[PDB]
C-alpha cells in the first residue's frame, strides 16, 4: 500500500520591534533627561533588532 506522513519545518518567526525609550522611560520628562546621558544605548538595541 502507500503510506503518507506530514512534517513541519519552521522558516520564520514573529518580527518583534522595540521602542527603547518608550519601554524604559515611558512618558515622564525627568526620565528622558536622565536617559539622554547614557549615550548610544538605545540606538544599538534598535539596530540589532533591525
Amino acid at each position: 500500500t502507500i503510506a503518507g506522513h506530514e512534517e513541519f519545518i519552521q522558516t520564520s518567526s514573529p518580527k518583534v520591534t522595540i521602542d527603547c525609550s518608550a519601554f524604559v522611560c515611558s512618558n515622564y520628562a525627568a526620565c528622558h533627561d536622565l536617559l539622554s546621558e547614557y549615550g548610544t544605548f538605545c540606538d544599538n538595541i534598535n539596530s540589532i533588532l533591525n
Partner: protein, 50 residues
C-alpha cells in the same frame, strides 16, 4: 540621509481636560490646637493622635 523606513519618535495622545474629585463639607483637623495644648507629655510617655 539615505532611502529607508525610519521608526520615529513615540507620541502620546495629549490629555484634553482634568477630572478633579474631592469630598465636600468635611470638618477641619485642627492640628494646631493639639500642638498648642497646655499639658505636654514627657519623652517617657509621648503622645499620639490620629
Amino acid at each position: 540621509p539615505n532611502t529607508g523606513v525610519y521608526d520615529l519618535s513615540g507620541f502620546t495622545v495629549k490629555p484634553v481636560a482634568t477630572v478633579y474629585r474631592r469630598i465636600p463639607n468635611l470638618p477641619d483637623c485642627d492640628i494646631d490646637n493639639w500642638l498648642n495644648n497646655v499639658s505636654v507629655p514627657s519623652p517617657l510617655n509621648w503622645e499620639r493622635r490620629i
